[PDB]
Structure 1
Amino acid sequence: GAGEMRDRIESMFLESWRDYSKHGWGYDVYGPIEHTSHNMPRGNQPLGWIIVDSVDTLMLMYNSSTLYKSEFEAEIQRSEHWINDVLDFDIDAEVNVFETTIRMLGGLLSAYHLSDVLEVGNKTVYLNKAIDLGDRLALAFLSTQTGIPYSSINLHSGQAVKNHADGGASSTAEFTTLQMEFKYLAYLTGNRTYWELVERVYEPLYKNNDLLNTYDGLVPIYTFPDTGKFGASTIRFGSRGDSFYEYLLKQYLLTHETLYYDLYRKSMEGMKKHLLAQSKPSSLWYIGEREQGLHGQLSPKMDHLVCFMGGLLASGSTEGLSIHEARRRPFFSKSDWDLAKGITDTCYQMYKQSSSGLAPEIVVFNDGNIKDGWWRSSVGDFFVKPLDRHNLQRPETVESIMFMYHLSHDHKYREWGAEIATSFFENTCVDCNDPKLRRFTSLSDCITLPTKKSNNMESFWLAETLKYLYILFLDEFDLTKVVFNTEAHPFPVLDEEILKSQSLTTGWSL
């Protein structure tokens, strides 16, 4: 039953949360096995990495819990007071602009939103925190002439610093996955600067590289900030590439700016033409990589991160509408929808065909040219390299499953989600037979049985994985009124007329 699954997911969240609160409260990094923790900044000041990333999940569960509503409420209060009284972003330390924007700025914005629409807590606490952090992060856009930011920035001084490696090139997805956050902040503050700075990165990216014509909208993962030109690098929908595509569509869903939908469409058709393929022997659809330009060979290697594509494609085709209604709209893309189901199925198979029921960090699909020390899936559709056997509690597959269920209403997706939730429960638990001490942790190896545990709980286990599994089992969730940032922090769809009155419009074109 949905309500029961709800109780179980809330239970898992609380088991992880109670343990974290008891042993690593206020710390950025936490290891459940040994109950150890530390902060990321050299000076040891906290960034709120886990707390801020988890607040909105607490609010969502508080809103529908029937067994622990009171506990969730108290924890929201605990988190809010800490964010208001302890957390301080005036830190003399360099932080990754992308991660801090999607997790911290995004989490504060979604906490504000949910605090607002759910009337729980004090939304002002989160908004004020978001404005201050947003200002510290925004200084990154002043470093280059192109407007493309360097990878890191000092939260106290505002000094920017290039990527230590890759010849100093920035990761393409890292500066193209900041738009939802800064645009929503612009909307809440009426401050156009946030919007202008974040939209600026696209023109040099598209124009200086002849992106549409030469690359069919597919981006190499590295781009030099000073020139805006791509560096010799792999073209993949995995890490450093993935969210560039995500935010093209999501900006359109959030602000109604059609230019981004058009760009998204171009990239999607390019993806279908150069990266799409099917595995043997189940003919599972998968997106491959091109390490040597579009004219090079196609690699069947696929990061689990690519699995977010199921939900993205479904979202872009339906615009949040249940297919019943979407199928009759002019904007509905039959191709995107069929592929969304296909990719979600493939990603589910990465769990179903896994010895532990959990998909590893990276897999290599069987393209008929898999000819050593690799592990073969149950059906043989993919292999797992010895070095990619870990599982970091990633959400991308349950993410897509959630979208597919709410848009299609096909109960099969809830069955898939339940199986995966069960696999996480049984294969990542520590002190599995004691509800009072049970916790969940990452795996150094999810292929060997019993699985081998790693002493680390990712903030996204709480911010994303458990959140999406939870939403999957909510009977009511209108995907036309919300747009999730890349760390699963929900922002409301913005009113076009209000954006216009605030002079928040597309400041460039192509």
Structure 2
Amino acid sequence: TPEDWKALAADVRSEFQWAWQGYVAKAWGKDEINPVSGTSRSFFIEGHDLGLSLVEALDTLWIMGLDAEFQAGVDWVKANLSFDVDGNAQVFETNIRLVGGLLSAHLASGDPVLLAKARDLADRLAKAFEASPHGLPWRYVNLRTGAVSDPETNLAEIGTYLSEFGVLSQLTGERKYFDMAKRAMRHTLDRRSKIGLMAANIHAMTGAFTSRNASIDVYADSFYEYLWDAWALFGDEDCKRWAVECVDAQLAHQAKRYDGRLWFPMVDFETGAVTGTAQSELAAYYAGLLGQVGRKAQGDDYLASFTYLQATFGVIPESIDVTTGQPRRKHTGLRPEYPDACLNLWLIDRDPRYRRLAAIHYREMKATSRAAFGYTALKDITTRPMTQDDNCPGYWWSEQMKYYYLLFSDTPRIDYGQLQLSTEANVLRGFRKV
């Protein structure tokens, strides 16, 4: 019997609503639910929650037509969410989760307050960029005082702002946000090696690399996405060029086959020598990026490596050794990157193969991560049953349930031709209001 995709979408929505109910019951206004114990935890600042999962969920709720739930969350934000807080926040996470989550909710709803709050937060984060003579953000900033800490940063944490900041520039009319984000990316791109790679670790004050390791995953992932995404969102010609150049350098110097499968281990950014044997599950986003930038055959080949892991292990291991294709770790983070790739590749040609693969992933999530009050990360994927930890990461609310729903629902609330997703799956273009 052919899969009824619409029924599967309805199941995703049902499960999401059920999870939301658990969040409301156990963790209202708190950063994350621990759905086994039925408790909450903080994410950014211990004891000073910022409604993380609520904010992350908003655009997902809207897309699913969970309008009452969406509005309850928006109304909570409008009444309660403030960033005048004497505590340190990680700049990267704060941007991709809270600035981006408020922006997608703003674009869905039109509510000016959500933009006001996104912009307030971005202005607090801007102090981290201003504290570097290179415009490379420090990793942490005090939201109230602007004090910075930890300049030993990385490509992802200096280069995952341009989508949110660029949308802020579009909406506000102030180019400063776009410029600040682009300047940081240009810094490292200008320091590419002769073979076109960047090391993944960089110092905000010296502006120099602090390792020799080029990476597509750990320390770097979304830098490469945001180059393409800035072309797509803003028509930025430099970013279009850079996106393709960076990917072609990776395909030339980091693509390696082991036991017939494509992997992208870390390499020395100048010599191209392999410097590591680990690949993170997190790398799976890159299969989708490869398609986006016009390297779809390679993207499908890379997806196939992860499809192998899913078929073999059920849940994709958090990290594997590329030389053996086996797990390096037994726990998971309830990770979304496989359906991320499936959606991104499916948006190119609408091949139902990607739906089939994502349906496996969704069903496996249901079979392994369901707990009393929501969905949880795993302790051990090698036991049967797989043992659970007790945490629903904030990104679950923005990412995989949205990916599944977008893959299966064909919702009229999204213009699929105009759809743009941040690295946290915040929708930054493509809402079709009712």
If the length of structure 2 is used for normalisation, what is the TM-score?
Answer: 0.94
Alignment: residue pair count: 426
**Is the aligned partner of 1:272 residue 2:251?**
yes
- 1:399 is aligned, of 340, 345, 352, to 340
**Identity percentage of aligned residues:** 27
Q: What are the ranges of 5 or more consecutive residues in structure 2 without an aligned counterpart? A: none
Per-residue deviation, 1:452? 0.8
| SS in structure 2 of the partner of residue 223 of structure 1 | strand
Aligned partners of 1:287 and 1:300 also within 8 Å: no
Corresponding letter in the other structure for 1:337: K
Change (3 A) 1:291 1:301: farther
Per-residue deviation, 1:274? 1.2
| SS in structure 2 of the partner of residue 170 of structure 1 | strand
| SS in structure 1 of the partner of residue 37 of structure 2 | coil
Aligned partners of 2:317 and 2:332 also within 8 Å: yes
| SS in structure 2 of the partner of residue 285 of structure 1 | strand
Aligned partners of 1:80 and 1:125 also within 8 Å: no
2:422 aligned partner: 485
2:181 aligned partner: 198
Question: What is the correspondence of 1:163-202 to structure 2 with a 5 Å cutoff?
Answer: 168-202=151-185
2:51 aligned partner: 48
Change (3 A) 1:41 1:411: closer
CA distance in 2 between counterparts of 1:472 and 1:481 reads 15
Per-residue deviation, 1:342? 1.1
Question: What is the correspondence of 1:199-218 to structure 2 with a 5 Å cutoff?
Answer: 199-207=182-190, 209=191, 211=192, 213-214=193-194, 216-218=195-197
1:259-278: CA deviations, max 9, x gaps? 11111111111111111122
Corresponding letter in the other structure for 1:394: R
Q: CA RMSD in A?
A: 1.9
2:357 aligned partner: 416
Corresponding letter in the other structure for 1:483: Q
1:46-74: CA deviations, max 9, x gaps? 22211111100000101xxxxxxxxx222
1:454-507: CA deviations, max 9, x gaps? 0100111121011111111123665441221110001128xxxxxxxxxxxxxx
CA distance in 2 between counterparts of 1:113 and 1:489 reads 10
Corresponding letter in the other structure for 2:70: I
CA distance in 1 between counterparts of 2:44 and 2:251 reads 42
Change (3 A) 1:47 1:233: farther
**Is the aligned partner of 1:234 residue 2:234?**
no
CA distance in 1 between counterparts of 2:44 and 2:333 reads 22
| SS in structure 2 of the partner of residue 47 of structure 1 | coil
CA distance in 2 between counterparts of 1:88 and 1:422 reads 37
Corresponding letter in the other structure for 2:120: D
1:11 aligned partner: 14
- 1:460 is aligned, of 391, 395, 398, to 395
Question: What is the correspondence of 1:420-439 to structure 2 with a 5 Å cutoff?
Answer: 420-430=361-371, 437=372, 439=374
CA distance in 1 between counterparts of 2:143 and 2:24 reads 26
- 1:90 is aligned, of 84, 89, 100, to 84
Change (3 A) 1:257 1:480: farther
| SS in structure 2 of the partner of residue 232 of structure 1 | coil
Aligned partners of 2:253 and 2:272 also within 8 Å: no
Corresponding letter in the other structure for 1:359: I
Per-residue deviation, 1:233? 4.2
| SS in structure 1 of the partner of residue 399 of structure 2 | helix
Question: What is the correspondence of 1:73-472 to structure 2 with a 5 Å cutoff?
Answer: 73-116=67-110, 123-162=111-150, 168-207=151-190, 209=191, 211=192, 213-214=193-194, 216-280=195-259, 283-290=260-267, 294-297=271-274, 299-317=276-294, 336-354=295-313, 357-366=314-323, 370=324, 382-385=325-328, 388-430=329-371, 437=372, 439-472=374-407
| SS in structure 1 of the partner of residue 135 of structure 2 | coil
CA distance in 1 between counterparts of 2:182 and 2:406 reads 31
Corresponding letter in the other structure for 1:352: A
CA distance in 1 between counterparts of 2:401 and 2:89 reads 26
1:367-389: CA deviations, max 9, x gaps? xxx5xxxxxxxxxxx1112xx11
Change (3 A) 1:297 1:30: same
CA distance in 2 between counterparts of 1:15 and 1:293 reads 50
1:23-63: CA deviations, max 9, x gaps? 1111113211101113345572222211111100000101x
Per-residue deviation, 1:345? 1.9
Per-residue deviation, 1:217? 3.0
Per-residue deviation, 1:154? 0.6
CA distance in 1 between counterparts of 2:46 and 2:351 reads 50
CA distance in 2 between counterparts of 1:395 and 1:352 reads 16
| SS in structure 2 of the partner of residue 201 of structure 1 | helix
Change (3 A) 1:360 1:291: farther
If the length of structure 1 is used for normalisation, what is the TM-score?
Answer: 0.80
1:34 aligned partner: 37
Per-residue deviation, 1:94? 0.6
1:329 aligned partner: none
CA distance in 1 between counterparts of 2:153 and 2:50 reads 23
Change (3 A) 1:291 1:452: farther
Aligned partners of 2:16 and 2:401 also within 8 Å: yes
CA distance in 1 between counterparts of 2:75 and 2:304 reads 42
Corresponding letter in the other structure for 1:229: A
Per-residue deviation, 1:438? 5.6
1:406-456: CA deviations, max 9, x gaps? 3222212111111111110011112xxxxxx56321101122211010010
Corresponding letter in the other structure for 2:359: A
Corresponding letter in the other structure for 1:287: F
